[PDB]
Amino acid sequence: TTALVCDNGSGLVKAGFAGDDAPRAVFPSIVGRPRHQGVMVGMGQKDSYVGDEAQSKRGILTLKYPIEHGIITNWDDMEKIWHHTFYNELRVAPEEHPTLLTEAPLNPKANREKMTQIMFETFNVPAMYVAIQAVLSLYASGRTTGIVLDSGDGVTHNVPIYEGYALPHAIMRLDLAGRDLTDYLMKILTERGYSFVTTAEREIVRDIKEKLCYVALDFENEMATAASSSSLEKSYELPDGQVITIGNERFRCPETLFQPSFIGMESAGIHETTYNSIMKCDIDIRKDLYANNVLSGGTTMYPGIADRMQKEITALAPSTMKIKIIAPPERKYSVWIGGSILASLSTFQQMWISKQEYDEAGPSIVH
Amino acid sequence: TTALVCDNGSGLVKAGFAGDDAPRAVFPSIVGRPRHQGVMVGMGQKDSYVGDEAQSKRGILTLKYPIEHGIITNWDDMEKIWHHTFYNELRVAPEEHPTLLTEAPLNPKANREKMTQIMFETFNVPAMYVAIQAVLSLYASGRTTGIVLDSGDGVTHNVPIYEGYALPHAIMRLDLAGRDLTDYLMKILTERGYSFVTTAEREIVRDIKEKLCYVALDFENEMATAASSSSLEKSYELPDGQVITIGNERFRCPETLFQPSFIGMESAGIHETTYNSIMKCDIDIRKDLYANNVLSGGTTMYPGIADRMQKEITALAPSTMKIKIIAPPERKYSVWIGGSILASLSTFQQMWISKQEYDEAGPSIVH
Amino acid sequence: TTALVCDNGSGLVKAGFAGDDAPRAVFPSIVGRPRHQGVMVGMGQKDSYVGDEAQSKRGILTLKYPIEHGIITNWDDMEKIWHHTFYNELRVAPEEHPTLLTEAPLNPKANREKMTQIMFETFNVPAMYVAIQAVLSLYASGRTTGIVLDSGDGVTHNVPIYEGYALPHAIMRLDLAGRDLTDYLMKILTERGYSFVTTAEREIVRDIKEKLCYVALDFENEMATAASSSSLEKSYELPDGQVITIGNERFRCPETLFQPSFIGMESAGIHETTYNSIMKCDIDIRKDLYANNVLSGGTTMYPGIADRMQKEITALAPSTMKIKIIAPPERKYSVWIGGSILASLSTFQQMWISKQEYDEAGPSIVH
Amino acid sequence: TTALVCDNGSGLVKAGFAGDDAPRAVFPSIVGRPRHQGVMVGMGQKDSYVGDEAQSKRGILTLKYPIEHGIITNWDDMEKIWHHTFYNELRVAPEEHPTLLTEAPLNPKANREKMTQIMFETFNVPAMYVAIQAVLSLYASGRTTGIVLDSGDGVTHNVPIYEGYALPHAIMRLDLAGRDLTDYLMKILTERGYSFVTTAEREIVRDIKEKLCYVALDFENEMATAASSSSLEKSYELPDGQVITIGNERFRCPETLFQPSFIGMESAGIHETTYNSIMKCDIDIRKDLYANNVLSGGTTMYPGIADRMQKEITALAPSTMKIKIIAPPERKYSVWIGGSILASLSTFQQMWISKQEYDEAGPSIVH
Amino acid sequence: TTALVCDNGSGLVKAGFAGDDAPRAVFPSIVGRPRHQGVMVGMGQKDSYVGDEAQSKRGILTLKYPIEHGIITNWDDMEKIWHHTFYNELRVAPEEHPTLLTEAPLNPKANREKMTQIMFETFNVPAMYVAIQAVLSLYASGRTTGIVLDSGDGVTHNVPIYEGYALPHAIMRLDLAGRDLTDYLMKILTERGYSFVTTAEREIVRDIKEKLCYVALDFENEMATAASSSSLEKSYELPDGQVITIGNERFRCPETLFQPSFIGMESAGIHETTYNSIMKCDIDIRKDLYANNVLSGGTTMYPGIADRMQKEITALAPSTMKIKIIAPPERKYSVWIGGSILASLSTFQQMWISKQEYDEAGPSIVH
Ligand SMILES: Nc1ncnc2c1ncn2[C@@H]1O[C@H](COP(=O)(O)OP(=O)(O)O)[C@@H](O)[C@H]1O
Ligand SMILES: Nc1ncnc2c1ncn2[C@@H]1O[C@H](COP(=O)(O)OP(=O)(O)O)[C@@H](O)[C@H]1O
Ligand SMILES: Nc1ncnc2c1ncn2[C@@H]1O[C@H](COP(=O)(O)OP(=O)(O)O)[C@@H](O)[C@H]1O
Ligand SMILES: Nc1ncnc2c1ncn2[C@@H]1O[C@H](COP(=O)(O)OP(=O)(O)O)[C@@H](O)[C@H]1O
Ligand SMILES: Nc1ncnc2c1ncn2[C@@H]1O[C@H](COP(=O)(O)OP(=O)(O)O)[C@@H](O)[C@H]1O
Ligand SMILES: [Mg+2]
Ligand SMILES: [Mg+2]
Ligand SMILES: [Mg+2]
Ligand SMILES: [Mg+2]
Ligand SMILES: [Mg+2]
């Protein structure tokens, strides 16, 4: 009897059986709702739209994200994406295999006591377990020392590790992820005659950022030479029938992760939060984090991120020891791959929450 | 020497000398072109039309708006309304007094680099300056801290400001203003036998909206009682020789600004965009924006707006603090009045773009 | 001519003339710097704010403490709070009255060699004098023998004294005061859906701790019964209008001073550091420290601190002698009150550092 | 059949077979205990570490010395360093070779009756023997006349000898050794902006004292010239990467052994205790202790100790004779070398405590 | 006009007017000196303390005995205790009453020519006289025949006398008194985990010997039952609060007087000096020294001395006579009581040294 590893995170859904290598069920966490009525005769009059079906009719349906920066805002729409996975894509009954959920660290207590209630009352699950994304994304490389820089779509977290001894005090959250970049891209794209404000067109410009947009080496270097368009522009085709050509808006959009001054927050960037959290730790464990930094998530995919971490961090940190960053390919599933092999060990089975240990004790035992 | 304050925006044109209190030249941005020929002993000929002369001959001529939602569409018609202004109404040469232009915030770059070229190559202006309508409309009241709700004719902008230090990140534009309301009134009036398709009759129904049509307190409470037309109906004298009598189509037209669910967009109303931008600001400055909101523009003189904003915002925002809306009379000319007094200060003369500076720099120092 | 009693400590500033009973000019040690770049004419200006004016603009201005844990980190901003006080609030010329500064005990030599240089080269002061906190905080009670437990905001010090003869070897510093509590509260507050990361909201949650939060009698007794919402919760009125209600986060935040395991340091709590310093002294002077302990500072203000010192200390010490703790009201200003009466005696005027003496000896006669 | 020469002194452990010249098993007397509670699967485990493994994980493992100033404070942790050595470093069964322990002189009776019990009940040792570190470190040179100055890590002992005849009246213990110098270094290093309070950093600054710090020739000589530091400063490389440069803190830290007035103690230094004990002995044996003084231990390793003993002692003692001090290299391991050669003779084999004799007599025949 | 009887003995000072019964001026011979450097204003000052005030501040003041084993070591501290008595305790001018001093017998010419110089040059004493503590302590009982055993604090002297005639060849001094017992108690107390080295704690353990410690009947009859502590132990209450309980360390400390083998000196015990001195006298006076032995001093109030002198002396002396020891109460003040009644006679008044006689003869008439 295998286990079910599901990652209920913002952006995409990574669910599948344990012990595998790649999940066979991927779909964005969207809830489609009909806007107007029906201009033709002979269509589906249903209201609940879950899965990849809403992506084909974005101009007609209304998309909405149920999870907002990790914190579960809406609850009646969160159950829709959980029942459709176990009866359409996976096609497995939850009463036969345990479900291993995954939640972001530093999560408010208003979501942990309600997430286990859905997986017990509604969905009859024999045993469940939740943990921190930094641990599940650590087994993907086979190491137990370093710092995990998780940046998916909710909140960017920086949780280090030292031979299995976690440090909850070094958990410094940062509201700079994938959803925070598409918001700044909307206001910076309308300066060329491309007016957009409709929610249906928010995911159209997001696909352009995942390929064309990247992280440049310097900020005040490519901007002075951006007036002469020679290699920083490329024509993109839309399914509606328009031509979109960007110029200097390709490298300045991912700069928000490094420069929080674009949104208007006095917090530190992704290159400074990974260094300030190390200062709060012990001096003896401040030598195995610079050359052992691991960056995972779905947002950290711009061709040029690993080449920038060896400059801004090296300038702040004293240049004496060695600094090396590892960036393995296909890091979007670092939580699902590392979490599937975690349930294969024999020592992990002694941590599942029993059905009789919840209704007789209370939700205060999952913490 | 005095200055020239001209607000070249969609809808109407406000021009005049600086230091005054009311402009003396107002005319809509229309380009009259003869469509059908008409032989008559007396009239003839004059090909192109510009100014308030085309308003007297609408059934023969054809009007066209050169500016569309702030974005400058065509350019051969934008110069006609500028040369016919300083040599007919103002009767002053631009080579003697500086021209102070005004543009809408979050404007595309295709209009800033081209507007300064016309005011430098064609019209020999010694110095020019552009800014944001939210700042110029703030000097008309005589305050410092206060979010400006400018709703002219194209795009409604909400740019808050807390004691001089503005916040460009809280600029949330909305495509719901003046021109966006007369389009929905045409498709809703055809059900009562009053249908029009000619562009000449588009401004006839606009004058009816500026007087009879207003904003009510509630929407769903007036629809159930709309069957017994006793006080919500009034006959209108059509210049051609007809009687226009509307009933329930009086308060539902301005409701589009509050409920965008009538046209076909997933955007929010005018009372939600002014509240969502406050959430993005700091909590320390979220206590001087509800009781200090200032509304300006052309799409505001509806008798019944100040009494409605005190209820929709109160239903969403907590009722712990106090909410007070200020609406001074003659709020339509707040851009021209505030722009004339701004040039009277001695510290403002050090911000004009010199002619010798643009020839050495180029289209880059305007921003 | 009287003397100037100033306290250049972290948190708040206590300045005023000598011989008084309460300071007439208090302001936090914050520096105001603009975040964004507002576009106005005749605003401000004030590039670097100083004083209590930044409390009204905490969101716009970037708050930053120039002094960190007693050690003067930044120097160009430390002079701003020294010139703004002697020419706005006090309005006294430094060339007429001697300035009596106050520094924390066990400070680096880099601060004593630079603080006196500013009070000699820039600010022309005829005579100055520096001392440690446990001396000035002792004259406020009118006693001689008694260990002083000073806990202001940066570093908590425990400097005992037996009849004037101080003991520098028994000085045990602890980085657990006022600044270390608001940092742990920032991480424990986000567990209920209240996310805060901006520096502007660091002082907002600090005022809640100064009234609602207190030190309880036990730790595991009130927490086990905190599952039921009874009298352990109270709603606070934020300046914005939101409703914030905490549960068990009222007594667990002040517990960090007693249990340093919350942050992640192997140091001892405030109740154990005061006991280990007595062990390093002679046995004859180990009987006049438990019944004569004095606790001062700005942090020691929780209603329940004096009731706890008679239990944890009594349990460790042999239950035979008497342990009495004295805590007079208004113990925060005890450093400024004790320093004003110290400069009133005739035997204190023969200890000031002469202006001509420092220029002929150097910074080595300061100690 | 050889014997096992082990040293249970504080600081380091010197174990090995008898008849050799250098021990092959050295490790600090530290216990590794977990601090935080990590959430990992398959970590460690090892709840209690022992050996040199804790030196690589000092930031997490809480360092704690089981022996304090010779007196065994903790007993459950003292057995950990004994069983780990006989099965990992030495890899020899205690049932085949006798174990020769070494204890400090003037040891309390509560330790001799307990240390011998562990080697009989838990471990199965055929015969054991305890004595005094002064006589054991005397045979390392080849003489049996003079005074042995043993300064290991906790308590410095000065026990003379005169042809086998011991003098217990001249035994004057002093709490000034290796552990007493690193405590004063913790408070004297923070005077330059380098704050330290964590127990893990106690061994980091200890390595600097064992190499850079030394004993100068005079106290009031190198301090007056500390303003123009031309050769008393040197940059040290930390494992983290920070740069720490000390000035006058290089010679003033080891001065505590000569001037006990630094830590608030009015006792005599290492140069005065060795002179007062001689005056308490006979008169004819006064010419065999000045020119025959032997210094041993781990603390007496600073390059400059032998050059200072010829000035302070000669100034006090009459200069009518000769005072020669012997300091052979590798004097730290003199206790283990002298303990192995002593068990090689035939007169020492008849002094071991038989296992069957301890059961018939009791814990009273050990003294 | 009466006389002043002052005793300059080590340990305590017995001064008062002649003709009384108990002295009213008693204080230890200690000189309080500041150890640390307190940074306070209005403390002390008193650079040199003298009297019973130093007993309340032992943990700060440095204790030092000006007289060592009778021989005056430091003369600058000896004058301090002489001037403090005549102006605080006695409150009598030395120019009105003669001062009667008393020195120790058998002096190597060091306390005769220098002791009288202070009472003549500095102090203005009309007449003074010095003698021997043995004869002066004999008049307290009313007899003129018998050996006097004066065991105070420095050196125990045994000078017999047979009706006025004093044999100088029978004077046998022994360095075993009160100060010689508290030194052996320091090294014998640390064998139970109670370490002491501070000079302030030397008087704390001395007070325990004056009550709990006493002279037992034998020696080997109590060491066999010392392992089972049933009635030979008692918990002592320290002024700090610690619990110190000794076992066999109660009667073994006073045994050093009888058995000097615990130190290492070649001299015999106190019961051999009283027997060997009789053999050096005449043969006819051998029947008046065993039954007329008088023991006095400070080292005699041990409950268990009269029961021991009748066993060791009787076993050595021939059992063909009568042996009886007399021990009147308050034997410690026998020197001051016997010295005051001696000055009341008309014969002793003609033996004083006149002020005009010492200046004309010299320091040679003191003997
Ligand atoms: N190649 C890419 N380049 C840039 N951004 C990407 C790329 N791929 C995905 N993203 C961003 O990642 C987000 C989705 O993250 P997701 O995979 O859901 O994180 P997680 O796996 O932790 O749930 C999207 O909003 C998208 O903007
Ligand atoms: N009294 C009124 N009531 C309602 N709407 C009005 C009124 N006056 C003008 N408007 C609207 O304002 C629009 C013109 O705005 P305009 O004055 O050009 O704005 P701005 O002054 O900012 O350029 C017109 O489309 C018209 O519908
Ligand atoms: N009533 C209170 N309860 C708890 N903490 C307080 C209270 N008043 C002040 N503090 C803490 O004291 C700190 C300020 O200390 P301060 O008065 O500057 O010390 P000092 O007077 O020694 O400079 C603040 O950070 C605040 O958190
Ligand atoms: N090279 C050195 N210079 C100065 N001090 C040293 C040196 N090596 C060791 N020490 C001191 O010796 C102490 C350890 O003594 P240790 O070798 O354990 O004594 P023992 O061998 O008698 O157990 C440490 O506290 C350290 O301060
Ligand atoms: N009750 C007592 N029992 C035992 N020893 C005592 C007692 N009282 C005093 N002593 C000892 O006597 C010493 C003081 O002697 P002191 O009275 O000064 O002699 P003197 O009177 O000859 O100067 C102290 O060191 C103390 O140890
Ligand atoms: Mg993730
Ligand atoms: Mg406008
Ligand atoms: Mg203070
Ligand atoms: Mg040793
Ligand atoms: Mg005496």
Share in helix of chain A = 10-25%
**Large-scale geometry of chain A:** flat
CATH architecture of the largest domain in chain A: 2-Layer Sandwich
Radius of gyration of chain A, Cα only, in angstroms? 22 Å
Mind describing the biggest β-sheet of chain A?
5 strands, mixed
CATH class of the largest domain in chain A: Alpha Beta
Examine the coordinates and then state which fold CATH places here, giving the name of the CATH topology of the largest domain in chain A: Nucleotidyltransferase, domain 5
Q: Roughly how many Å apart are the termini of chain A?
A: 26 Å
Domains of chain A, number: 3
Structural class category of chain A: alpha/beta
Query: SSE order of chain A, as H and E?
Result: EEEEEEHHEHEHEEEHHEEHEHEH
Beta fraction of chain A:
5-15%
The oligomeric state of the chains shown is 5 chains of a larger assembly
Annotation field: number of helices of chain A: 9
Largest interface: A-D, 28 and 26 residues
Strand elements of chain A, count:
15
Bound molecules: adenosine-5'-diphosphate, magnesium ion
Provide the spatial order of strands within the biggest beta sheet of chain A. Answer: 11-10-9-14-15
Main location (chains A, B, C, D, E): cytoplasm
GO biological process, one term (chains A, B, C, D, E): heart contraction
Family (chains A, B, C, D, E): Belongs to the actin family.
Pfam family, one (chains A, B, C, D, E): Actin
